[PDB]
Symmetry: C2
Subunit: 191 residues, 2 copies
Amino acid sequence: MVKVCLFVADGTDEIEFSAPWGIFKRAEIPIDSVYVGENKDRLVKMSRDVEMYANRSYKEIPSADDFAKQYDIAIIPGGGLGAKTLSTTPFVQQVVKEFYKKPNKWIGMICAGVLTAKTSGLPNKQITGHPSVRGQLEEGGYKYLDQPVVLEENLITSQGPGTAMLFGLKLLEQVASKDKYNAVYKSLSMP
Amino acid sequence: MVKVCLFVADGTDEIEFSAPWGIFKRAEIPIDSVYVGENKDRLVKMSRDVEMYANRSYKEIPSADDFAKQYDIAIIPGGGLGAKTLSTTPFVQQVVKEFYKKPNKWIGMICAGVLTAKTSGLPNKQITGHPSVRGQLEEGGYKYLDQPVVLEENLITSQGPGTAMLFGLKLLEQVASKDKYNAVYKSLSMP
């Protein structure tokens, strides 16, 4: 059974957090929110001011190697300020570098969260992200695709709050059986 | 200054709460989360286990007339348990009945939250909701439309987590200038 880590920081976007969270919960696949921040109660101020608790602090996990024995999917959501913090945290970079190209691991990044590919020195060729980070990614030698969701190797990237459902679904698609994926998909009333 | 109330209860769906929340926040339109439930600290256990503080408890608002003095838009999200609670709370029904067909008031319901139209006795002819409540809506006499969003008078109804962004947008469209609406829309990277 696959387990998912949804990273979260102060300033993480509520929509981009909620889509993969709700999708993996519907799929009955374990998922933990893992806070990168200093609040000792794991209380998070989200990008648009929702105050919510995370399940864990990243300080509970000693290394990317230990992280990899705990989780199979690592998700880095966006929101301007949350993405800045996540993309500049050495631990998150180490996890991303460790997971990349592993046959039993997957990475998701959405909106400004995709800056983590660049900061982690990932060598994928093609990518998407929020149009506001397009310049930054093309400087990193990435070919930017203007579409909701991109997959290269085991890195799923996505554009923004409007694509967070498609992003969560693409991650689920990698680990769910056909019947589980189809059932979850059908339950969402996708447009 | 348009002022939005996003109702929330234990068991409210994370995705359907976060979409209108983030959209109105982007539009710089004031929005409060207003909790209906037993928790005296406004700590809400959401449908898929997120624990989040609401801004207010509905108990702070002495009547539906007083609510109408404070808010112009009332939003009722889904999730099975959350919608059961909200749809069966007379305060919520009273707000919905008061707002219906009133100039410059708006009501939004999504997924199982649409049961509030039936419990409030709203005389709109057409409606949508989650396929899971399709029969029950039909039983109250509504004509069900299989499309993401239905607008009738000043009632916006919508289907499910997959349509929560289209739902939040349709609400925003009624109250924002075309210029503001287009800017918010553009920022979301809608597919």
